[PDB]
């Protein structure tokens, strides 16, 4: 009766169809059976990494026994599954847990050869005492069948330490299925999720939810890393087919919130916020327009979806993991053609490099680049102060809308061998081990970032050999043994090699400072030109706009004359320091006079000071 | 944990009167170890500001013991005493 | 607690809450975990979802469900005997399963679920993978990979939700919404030109901490100081008197 | 060159956009990237830069939608699709 | 010979010739999936104390249950090809 008390049946559950179809995996089930019906050592144990299906195999064996598809001495066995948790509970006296275990073991002994004891997380037996060792005598007598299941490493963490036990089990290896077998398992499990929710699931969906969760989610294993996408897409579609679909459930809750803002911001007895209200109204209206249009289109579609297609899976893969793998919904494809003219709002010239940076992004949005390699990795090099670091920051802002969100490391500190452990972690058992790497732990999560190595040639030519397997293979392994993948990042290396030669010295110095197998891995090695006298007026107006935006927190916008701009773009030009002299000149000329005029009264806020050309200086 | 819960309950039962004061609070981190469980049972009550906990530690045992626990440093305001 | 109006208004973060919902309402393995740096708002999301349930904006699969806040600390309080903690946790699990999914257990700081042993926080592993107990957890970014990811058998039963920090434009709105809760506690008024400054200013000076949290402290401290000034004399009239009463 | 183009086709067979390359095209390719100092990687670089660039320029500009086969041919310098 | 690896030898030469595609092709037709090759890179093992990275750390230290990195792959299911990049 103790079996009725503590453990719970499994075949009784199988008889009522409470378990799922167990498509595939016949080889391992046969192996389990022929190990289970052996003379001595009839104790199989399932070993494999988590998620591959190990309780599924015992469920399948249960279905098999109930249907009657087993060899002779396995008819009507009534597989039983222990429960050590409920076994040791409320047994607060000195001889209770071992007594209950005695009763259970005796009841298993009395049944001649029917019961099949089944323990999941087998390793949890090695303790359980304060015991849990009154099983070696029984296993020595073959009385117990003890089909077990654990993972690959808890095995050698809790069992192999007791090799008196590890002898009594025979290991069965359970390797993860391939994409085909995954498609197969999904084609059989589809029916139950179609029933739990109320939607339809095409076969293109059951193909995508396996071929996609294999290229992107490189941390879990197939049979469930591919099911979870389907089981989320179903629930999302249910939500949609209920009250209003998404992308209307955002503009509604956004227009409402903007309204709540504006109907309480207007009653501010101030003038400063009077220009912060002259935009809230504008955007609130411009969004009311869009909500109206979309709600109207809803009527056209309702008069003139109902199944989880192939791209809802992709939407889930994008909501997870952040990587955009969608279908280019007709609004992004305009940005991807205006990419060059949108970068040109922040960088000027170097179009031979802008075209190359940008072309490697549409090339991956159209799904044409190689799938196991970085999304593109190339090195900038040219004279000083030309733009070769502004361009990387302008590209990392066009993609995420915040310049601060790029992983950036300055290679002017990695000057010795041992400072490689600064970005890879520390080998096992040492001081900083719980901290992991520094380049790794920021690309192990959200692997859509942009990686920037400034001044790569300042390093030690042994850091160059981590980027060997970073480039052209896309993965590296930190100290913990984990393998992060760089198959979605955009690596960028800046440098200043040569800086004095036209075009031969730069290449000669590159070939002399790097290895051939390192310059051979990159994409095009771009060269920046150097600014021309014509190309500085377009920087002068940029700098002046930026400065005006700075001193716009006190409503103090400038008013610059065209002779002033021409003088400013003619004074600071020298073609050896790039474009920083212009910045220092703007400061020294304008900001000094402005700061001496500002804190000496006479330029109190809400003013518009003009600047104009005097013979040499330029007075306000 | 029993004693800690008793003290926290009696601090909370008062009408916000008590102002606890832990001197050298860099010892609160690994209060009871065995597996992180103890010393951060007060972490729900710090945020709501139920107990007040003015404490004081030296300048380099604050980044050797606490700053290694960025979730708990968040609940503390630093007053630099030069 | 959310019914009696005891929680702060939650603003924005629509995508996070909708993903929490559409994960919390699947067949098996229906338990999300919020993840992200400390301070960016991860208990705020659960409280927003609770207020949302009380109002009734949630889908049919979640209308009329209660959220219980499990407290692992008060379970190991008195358990010196050899089975009492397991007995307690088993009663709790049986009672959760005894309902028909009308309960959503919410464990805060769930990295503390690994211990409790001395074979504990491990008897939950069966009921997790089947979807009986709906678990909503939230731990910071780097204690995850320190206590959980070490146990890939247990971190398989969790679906991660990343919570990135907001920007300045969004923090401004969050403050615009939260102002009227400090306006009451401190008997003062707060100006919108100050709500913009407490967010632009605290973004170039305090870099050791993350968003909104590092922008609400300024507002709260300013209000508390202003109330102090209101009661007593103003500053720079107080210290001049304190040191004079000492030089004497 | 044949192995590269076969793998490329197998890759962009997920949108059913099979390709059609001519013998003068394959000869132009196998002649272009040959320099005996870097090996074969320049061939993959040239394949990408010369075909995938244009193809992905068009693929998101409409006109090359799924279920299609576009032929390539040698032009004086480049090879127009 | 029955006490020696079933094969162990080196090839070397200029870059972009195939000295890696050859090993990959070898691992592809014995196991039918190229993922089934143990590939470790000797460019990260530039330090002396990184010998315990593929051997494990002694008992009583921090990284102990994690086991090795090369040994723990060949202890379970030894049939692969091991690549020394
Ligand atoms: N062949 C299969 N047929 C049907 N479902 C499967 C199959 N293989 C795996 N699954 C499903 O994938 C998941 C695997 O569950 P389990 O096998 O219990 O986990 P596990 O493989 O035992 O690893 P752990 O350590 O228990 S998490 C379940 O949702 C199964 O239903
Ligand atoms: N083409 C450009 N367009 C706009 N600003 C530019 C341009 N070139 C330089 N600048 C300015 O120069 C500064 C940035 O120069 P950087 O390109 O970052 O210097 P650099 O290219 O990194 O050269 P080094 O060798 O690394 S110092 C900013 O003040 C920019 O405004
Ligand atoms: N979206 C939001 N709307 C309103 N208030 C918010 C929002 N996000 C955060 N807050 C407030 O900012 C603070 C954030 O605190 P919590 O989010 O509870 O702490 P936390 O983000 O969970 O960080 P940890 O990991 O718990 S230490 C609280 O005062 C919240 O009320
Ligand atoms: N004979 C070849 N057979 C097959 N692929 C080749 C051959 N020669 C070059 N390749 C391809 O060209 C690239 C060269 O790959 P690798 O073998 O790694 O280069 P490598 O010869 O190893 O030079 P290093 O020193 O490793 S950079 C791969 O894309 C190969 O597929």
Short mmCIF file of N, CA, C and O in Angstrom, two decimals, chain A residues 330-387:
data_model
loop_
_atom_site.label_atom_id
_atom_site.label_comp_id
_atom_site.label_asym_id
_atom_site.label_seq_id
_atom_site.Cartn_x
_atom_site.Cartn_y
_atom_site.Cartn_z
N UNK A 330 8.26 47.15 -45.71
CA UNK A 330 7.96 48.24 -46.64
C UNK A 330 8.23 49.64 -46.10
O UNK A 330 8.08 50.62 -46.83
N UNK A 331 8.63 49.75 -44.84
CA UNK A 331 8.95 51.04 -44.28
C UNK A 331 10.43 51.11 -43.96
O UNK A 331 11.05 52.17 -43.99
N UNK A 332 10.99 49.94 -43.67
CA UNK A 332 12.43 49.80 -43.49
C UNK A 332 13.17 49.84 -44.81
O UNK A 332 14.27 50.40 -44.86
N UNK A 333 12.60 49.27 -45.87
CA UNK A 333 13.25 49.27 -47.17
C UNK A 333 13.45 50.66 -47.74
O UNK A 333 14.26 50.82 -48.66
N UNK A 334 12.75 51.67 -47.22
CA UNK A 334 13.04 53.05 -47.58
C UNK A 334 14.26 53.56 -46.85
O UNK A 334 15.12 54.24 -47.44
N UNK A 335 14.35 53.26 -45.55
CA UNK A 335 15.55 53.60 -44.79
C UNK A 335 16.78 52.94 -45.39
O UNK A 335 17.86 53.53 -45.44
N UNK A 336 16.64 51.71 -45.87
CA UNK A 336 17.80 51.00 -46.40
C UNK A 336 18.26 51.56 -47.74
O UNK A 336 19.38 51.27 -48.15
N UNK A 337 17.43 52.33 -48.43
CA UNK A 337 17.87 53.03 -49.62
C UNK A 337 18.30 54.46 -49.34
O UNK A 337 19.08 55.02 -50.12
N UNK A 338 17.82 55.05 -48.26
CA UNK A 338 18.30 56.35 -47.81
C UNK A 338 19.45 56.25 -46.83
O UNK A 338 19.81 57.26 -46.22
N UNK A 339 19.99 55.05 -46.60
CA UNK A 339 21.07 54.88 -45.63
C UNK A 339 22.22 55.83 -45.90
O UNK A 339 22.75 56.46 -44.97
N UNK A 340 22.64 55.95 -47.15
CA UNK A 340 23.81 56.76 -47.45
C UNK A 340 23.53 58.24 -47.19
O UNK A 340 24.33 58.92 -46.54
N UNK A 341 22.41 58.75 -47.68
CA UNK A 341 22.07 60.14 -47.44
C UNK A 341 21.70 60.42 -46.00
O UNK A 341 21.65 61.59 -45.60
N UNK A 342 21.43 59.39 -45.20
CA UNK A 342 21.15 59.60 -43.79
C UNK A 342 22.42 59.59 -42.96
O UNK A 342 22.52 60.31 -41.97
N UNK A 343 23.39 58.77 -43.35
CA UNK A 343 24.72 58.87 -42.75
C UNK A 343 25.37 60.19 -43.11
O UNK A 343 25.98 60.83 -42.24
N UNK A 344 25.23 60.63 -44.35
CA UNK A 344 25.81 61.89 -44.79
C UNK A 344 25.33 63.11 -44.03
O UNK A 344 25.87 64.20 -44.25
N UNK A 345 24.33 62.96 -43.16
CA UNK A 345 23.93 64.04 -42.28
C UNK A 345 24.86 64.19 -41.09
O UNK A 345 24.70 65.13 -40.32
N UNK A 346 25.80 63.27 -40.92
CA UNK A 346 26.73 63.30 -39.81
C UNK A 346 28.18 63.12 -40.21
O UNK A 346 29.06 63.65 -39.53
N UNK A 347 28.47 62.41 -41.29
CA UNK A 347 29.80 62.29 -41.85
C UNK A 347 29.77 62.95 -43.21
O UNK A 347 28.71 63.06 -43.83
N UNK A 348 30.93 63.41 -43.68
CA UNK A 348 31.02 64.14 -44.93
C UNK A 348 32.19 63.60 -45.73
O UNK A 348 33.28 63.41 -45.19
N UNK A 349 31.96 63.35 -47.01
CA UNK A 349 32.97 62.72 -47.82
C UNK A 349 33.13 61.26 -47.41
O UNK A 349 32.28 60.68 -46.73
N UNK A 350 34.25 60.68 -47.83
CA UNK A 350 34.55 59.27 -47.57
C UNK A 350 33.42 58.38 -48.08
O UNK A 350 33.08 57.35 -47.48
N UNK A 351 32.81 58.78 -49.20
CA UNK A 351 31.70 58.01 -49.74
C UNK A 351 32.14 56.63 -50.18
O UNK A 351 31.34 55.69 -50.14
N UNK A 352 33.40 56.48 -50.58
CA UNK A 352 33.93 55.16 -50.88
C UNK A 352 33.88 54.24 -49.66
O UNK A 352 33.88 53.02 -49.83
N UNK A 353 33.83 54.80 -48.46
CA UNK A 353 33.68 54.01 -47.25
C UNK A 353 32.24 53.91 -46.78
O UNK A 353 31.84 52.89 -46.22
N UNK A 354 31.45 54.97 -46.99
CA UNK A 354 30.03 54.91 -46.63
C UNK A 354 29.32 53.85 -47.46
O UNK A 354 28.54 53.05 -46.93
N UNK A 355 29.58 53.82 -48.77
CA UNK A 355 28.96 52.81 -49.62
C UNK A 355 29.33 51.41 -49.18
O UNK A 355 28.51 50.50 -49.27
N UNK A 356 30.55 51.22 -48.68
CA UNK A 356 30.97 49.89 -48.29
C UNK A 356 30.39 49.48 -46.95
O UNK A 356 29.99 48.32 -46.78
N UNK A 357 30.34 50.39 -45.98
CA UNK A 357 29.70 50.07 -44.71
C UNK A 357 28.23 49.75 -44.93
O UNK A 357 27.73 48.73 -44.43
N UNK A 358 27.53 50.58 -45.68
CA UNK A 358 26.09 50.41 -45.85
C UNK A 358 25.72 49.19 -46.68
O UNK A 358 24.76 48.50 -46.33
N UNK A 359 26.47 48.89 -47.74
CA UNK A 359 26.12 47.77 -48.61
C UNK A 359 26.11 46.45 -47.87
O UNK A 359 25.41 45.53 -48.30
N UNK A 360 26.84 46.32 -46.78
CA UNK A 360 26.88 45.07 -46.04
C UNK A 360 25.72 44.91 -45.08
O UNK A 360 25.68 43.92 -44.34
N UNK A 361 24.78 45.85 -45.06
CA UNK A 361 23.60 45.75 -44.23
C UNK A 361 22.38 45.32 -45.04
O UNK A 361 21.64 44.42 -44.64
N UNK A 362 22.16 45.95 -46.19
CA UNK A 362 21.12 45.45 -47.08
C UNK A 362 21.46 44.05 -47.56
O UNK A 362 20.57 43.22 -47.76
N UNK A 363 22.75 43.75 -47.71
CA UNK A 363 23.17 42.43 -48.16
C UNK A 363 22.79 41.34 -47.18
O UNK A 363 22.70 40.18 -47.57
N UNK A 364 22.56 41.69 -45.92
CA UNK A 364 22.10 40.73 -44.94
C UNK A 364 20.61 40.84 -44.66
O UNK A 364 20.02 39.88 -44.17
N UNK A 365 20.00 41.99 -44.94
CA UNK A 365 18.55 42.09 -44.84
C UNK A 365 17.87 41.33 -45.96
O UNK A 365 16.79 40.76 -45.76
N UNK A 366 18.46 41.31 -47.14
CA UNK A 366 17.91 40.50 -48.21
C UNK A 366 18.25 39.02 -48.05
O UNK A 366 17.88 38.24 -48.93
N UNK A 367 18.93 38.63 -46.98
CA UNK A 367 19.27 37.23 -46.78
C UNK A 367 20.20 36.67 -47.84
O UNK A 367 19.95 35.57 -48.36
N UNK A 368 21.27 37.38 -48.17
CA UNK A 368 22.18 36.96 -49.22
C UNK A 368 23.58 36.67 -48.70
O UNK A 368 24.30 35.88 -49.33
N UNK A 369 23.99 37.25 -47.58
CA UNK A 369 25.32 37.02 -47.05
C UNK A 369 25.43 35.62 -46.46
O UNK A 369 24.44 34.95 -46.18
N UNK A 370 26.67 35.19 -46.26
CA UNK A 370 26.91 33.85 -45.74
C UNK A 370 26.40 33.75 -44.31
O UNK A 370 26.60 34.68 -43.52
N UNK A 371 25.73 32.66 -43.94
CA UNK A 371 25.10 32.60 -42.62
C UNK A 371 26.02 32.23 -41.48
O UNK A 371 25.61 32.38 -40.32
N UNK A 372 27.23 31.75 -41.74
CA UNK A 372 28.18 31.43 -40.66
C UNK A 372 29.47 32.20 -40.92
O UNK A 372 30.45 31.67 -41.46
N UNK A 373 29.47 33.45 -40.50
CA UNK A 373 30.54 34.43 -40.62
C UNK A 373 29.96 35.70 -40.01
O UNK A 373 28.73 35.83 -39.96
N UNK A 374 30.76 36.64 -39.51
CA UNK A 374 30.20 37.91 -39.07
C UNK A 374 29.39 38.58 -40.16
O UNK A 374 29.52 38.28 -41.35
N UNK A 375 28.53 39.50 -39.75
CA UNK A 375 27.72 40.23 -40.71
C UNK A 375 28.52 41.16 -41.54
O UNK A 375 27.93 41.85 -42.37
N UNK A 376 29.83 41.20 -41.34
CA UNK A 376 30.71 42.09 -42.08
C UNK A 376 31.72 42.72 -41.15
O UNK A 376 31.35 43.32 -40.14
N UNK A 377 33.00 42.60 -41.48
CA UNK A 377 34.05 43.07 -40.58
C UNK A 377 35.20 43.61 -41.40
O UNK A 377 35.85 42.85 -42.12
N UNK A 378 35.45 44.91 -41.30
CA UNK A 378 36.47 45.55 -42.11
C UNK A 378 37.12 46.67 -41.32
O UNK A 378 36.58 47.15 -40.33
N UNK A 379 38.29 47.10 -41.79
CA UNK A 379 39.17 47.99 -41.05
C UNK A 379 39.30 49.32 -41.77
O UNK A 379 39.52 49.36 -42.98
N UNK A 380 39.18 50.41 -41.02
CA UNK A 380 39.40 51.75 -41.53
C UNK A 380 40.82 52.18 -41.20
O UNK A 380 41.34 51.86 -40.13
N UNK A 381 41.44 52.92 -42.11
CA UNK A 381 42.76 53.46 -41.83
C UNK A 381 43.02 54.66 -42.73
O UNK A 381 42.67 54.64 -43.91
N UNK A 382 43.63 55.69 -42.16
CA UNK A 382 43.91 56.92 -42.86
C UNK A 382 44.51 57.95 -41.93
O UNK A 382 44.75 57.68 -40.75
N UNK A 383 44.76 59.15 -42.43
CA UNK A 383 45.38 60.19 -41.59
C UNK A 383 44.52 60.58 -40.41
O UNK A 383 43.39 60.11 -40.27
N UNK A 384 45.04 61.45 -39.55
CA UNK A 384 44.40 61.75 -38.29
C UNK A 384 43.24 62.72 -38.47
O UNK A 384 43.24 63.56 -39.37
N UNK A 385 42.25 62.60 -37.58
CA UNK A 385 41.12 63.50 -37.54
C UNK A 385 40.37 63.64 -38.85
O UNK A 385 40.10 64.75 -39.30
N UNK A 386 40.03 62.51 -39.47
CA UNK A 386 39.37 62.53 -40.76
C UNK A 386 37.93 62.04 -40.69
O UNK A 386 37.10 62.46 -41.51
N UNK A 387 37.59 61.19 -39.73
CA UNK A 387 36.21 60.76 -39.59
C UNK A 387 36.08 59.29 -39.26
O UNK A 387 34.98 58.80 -39.03
#
